[PDB]
Design a protein around this nucleic acid. Structure first.
Lengths: 101, 205, 58, 146
RNA sequence: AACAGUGGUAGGAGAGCGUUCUAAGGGCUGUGAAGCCAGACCGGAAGGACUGGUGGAGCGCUUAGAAGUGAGAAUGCCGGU
RNA sequence: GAACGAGGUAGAUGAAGAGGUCUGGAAAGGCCCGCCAUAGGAGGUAACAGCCCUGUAGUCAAAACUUCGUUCGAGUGGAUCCUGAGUACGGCGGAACACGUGAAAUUCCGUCGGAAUCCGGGAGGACCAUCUCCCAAGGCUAAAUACUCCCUAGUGACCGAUAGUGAACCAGUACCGUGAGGGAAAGGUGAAAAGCACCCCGGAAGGGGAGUGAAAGAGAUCCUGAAACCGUGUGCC
């Protein structure tokens, strides 16, 4: 899973293009990532435990990792992900630059 | 046969008049039919198998009486009319190959080679040597030969500069002169030889 | 308890006669113990019997 | 021959005379094997040379066979394959093998006498027919007996 | 072109249709395929398309090759009625 | 008995476009362009992907357990003795040899007056001599070869749920049988549970709206949904 929770994720395709944002949650066993803004469905809820207002709730649905790419911290550009070692721990390395994270 | 010749760069150089014993026979189109169905046959492993009435894990009992009752005869719970079923005949493991006589397979190669002399999809390229195994150099050669389709290269003794290259190119496969594949010469439809392999063809036929 | 010509000796099998309380008892070498030459070389040890015509003539 | 246009010589391929599919083609119901015979059932039937109970032909004839161990298949030369050679050459059974004259030396090379020669030859071999001994001398050739 | 013949069971002989899979070419598909559903189209026949409606992802042709090769009857198997 | 080298039991690294557009719920598709390659096997992601993701080519990785492979008594005699003891050999019992006892060798595997032993013995399809071959009656012995329950890797003019393992699913179960045993049936919502809040009808069950989703006839044995069959209407009789 080449993307860390809390990055600057850019959405490739799907029902919404264009929008970028941050990860709110992840599901690596199911290969799905919950990102703010995108894939927001209007969900029905019954007036049950955890605030029985019922109504139509509003939240986002998780997106598969293949729509997710991080942007360049040097240019603001959708770049691919490599790997280097800088004094100890392996770090993520964005392509098209010598950038990290 | 007066087949032309080019350079590794692709520039026009001195040609080679080939040998009529190998490249100047008439095309024997009846042999080429029965040539390829030999080689196509022994590319199939044919390892298909179906459990018969015996290898069926059951069967056995007369499932009820034979008289006194109402049904048909129906004499084992796994006969072929039944739903669980042993297939009646089915396919069994076997081979498909058969070794044609040597005078056929000599003539079968030569008629294809003599055809491509007429078909002009054949270019002798001496000394195909490369620094790296990079297919970008290989792609530059092919567009320098105006080949936008399938192609074949006959090396002398499987030069690894050619051999490690071009396995990534879809339409081009690499083969040496010891491995002149009767399907692939017909299949790839355009053909390249090194000059050392030209006599290596001629020394065996 | 043997010889060298057919496979039947002091071994392990069956019998069911009566009066009926039971375990292991014997088939032994059926001796009556004297010379031969089918091998004429002596110690005068055991014999058993499946058939005894044409052992020899004399 | 292109892969798009594969075709045989007409007469070298021939479709199946496949048996038992519909009455339209024929061979439908009975499947070529008639009405209710013993020669129609599942493999039951007859040996090849069997006559229904009448004494079959291989027994009512006597036995006139006897085979010795010590037989010799002599190599058979019609004396005319030596006309493939020129005169004055060597004629040995080791030479007749690799020249394609005799494909198998079965312990003995006898030379028959049908035909004629015109070539003086150094002929040595195991046995000779009587007319072949004179026919080699008729061409002046020598008739050594190995 | 002319002349002649063409009912057929068992039975021999010759031509073709079609499904599955592969093989080179070609193409045709989210601007809707395969299937399914209908008709008044064509081919001598097995048949083959062409619009229309369903369906929501693949499949035809041309020539070849391989066959578990095509149903309406087994006091047939297995469901549904 | 120790050291090295290679392999295995977890791995890592890894090239090059959200290219622009057009439809569409959704681009990986079409169109117009690029680019990488010792990587255009394969899977995954809203549909068909060399460059979207896991990864594949190539190269490295082992604390520890291992696996394979490397390194630290000859000759010549010719007095005597020995050279396989309770068995080797045949024509009338049996069995294995292709051989059914025959002309029946031979090998053994139960049994009827106890041969030689180197000047010897056995065999060469009865036997006899000659002739060549060989010392039986003690034991050990790798490779080539027979095979698959698992494992690793990967093939297919193999099957696609009545097919293929009986068993794609809690299957050797459920059930039948005291019993040894016999032995089934049954996969598919979408790309995402976003799976129907809310309003009515009824005790619900179940709908009709609404809302969700591109589709709700897609809504819970949930894709396509034929025929039997059950129908509701109506044109002509």
């Amino acid at each position: 899973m080449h993307v860390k929770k809390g990055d600057k994720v850019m959405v490739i395709s799907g029902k919404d293009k264009g929008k970028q944002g941050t990860i709110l949650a992840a599901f690596p066993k199911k290969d799905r990532v919950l990102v703010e803004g995108v894939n927001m469905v209007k969900k029905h809820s019954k007036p049950t435990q955890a605030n029985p207002q019922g109504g139509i709730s509003n939240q986002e649905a998780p997106i598969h990792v293949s729509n997710v790419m991080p942007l360049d911290p040097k240019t603001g550009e959708v770049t691919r992900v490599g790997y280097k070692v800088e004094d100890g721990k392996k770090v993520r390395v964005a392509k098209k630059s010598g950038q990290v994270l | 046969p007066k087949v032309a010749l080019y350079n590794q760069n692709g520039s026009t150089a001195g040609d080679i008049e080939l040998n009529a014993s190998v490249f100047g026979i008439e095309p024997n189109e009846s042999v080429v039919f029965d040539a390829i169905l030999m080689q196509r046959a022994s590319l199939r492993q044919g390892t298909h198998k179906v459990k018969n009435r015996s290898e069926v894990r059951g069967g056995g009992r007369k499932p009820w009486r034979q008289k006194g009752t109402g049904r048909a005869r129906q004499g084992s719970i796994r006969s072929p009319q039944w739903r669980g079923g042993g297939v009646v005949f089915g396919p069994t493991p076997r081979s498909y190959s058969y070794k044609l006589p040597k005078k056929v397979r000599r003539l079968a190669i030569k008629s294809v080679l003599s055809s491509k002399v007429i078909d002009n999809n054949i270019i002798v390229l001496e000394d195909l040597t490369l620094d790296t195994a990079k297919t970008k150099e290989m792609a530059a050669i092919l567009k320098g030969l105006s080949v936008e389709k399938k192609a074949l290269i006959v090396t002398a003794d499987a030069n690894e500069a050619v051999a490690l290259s071009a396995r990534n190119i879809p339409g081009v496969t690499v083969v040496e002169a010891n491995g002149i594949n009767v399907l692939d010469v017909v299949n790839h439809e355009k053909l390249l030889i090194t000059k050392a392999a030209v006599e290596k063809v001629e020394e065996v036929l | 308890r043997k010889c060298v010509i057919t496979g039947k000796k002091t071994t392990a099998g069956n019998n069911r006669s009566h009066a009926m309380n039971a375990s292991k008892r014997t088939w032994g070498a059926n001796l009556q113990k004297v010379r031969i030459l089918v091998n004429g070389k002596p110690k005068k040890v055991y014999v058993s019997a499946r058939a005894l015509k044409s052992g020899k003539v004399e | 021959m292109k892969l798009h246009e594969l075709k045989p010589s007409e007469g070298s391929r021939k479709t199946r005379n496949r048996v038992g599919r519909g009455i339209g083609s024929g061979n439908g119901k009975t499947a070529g094997k008639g009405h209710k015979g013993q020669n129609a059932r599942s493999g039951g039937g007859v040996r090849p040379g069997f006559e229904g109970g009448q004494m079959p032909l291989f027994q009512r004839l006597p036995k006139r066979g006897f085979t010795n161990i010590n037989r010799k298949e002599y190599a058979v030369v019609n004396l005319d394959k030596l006309n493939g050679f020129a005169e004055g050459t060597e004629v040995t059974p080791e030479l007749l093998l690799e020249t394609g004259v005799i494909s198998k030396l079965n312990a003995g090379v006898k030379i028959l006498g049908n035909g004629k020669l015109e070539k003086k030859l150094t002929v040595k071999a195991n046995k000779f027919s009587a007319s072949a001994k004179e026919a080699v001398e008729a061409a002046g050739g020598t008739a050594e007996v190995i």
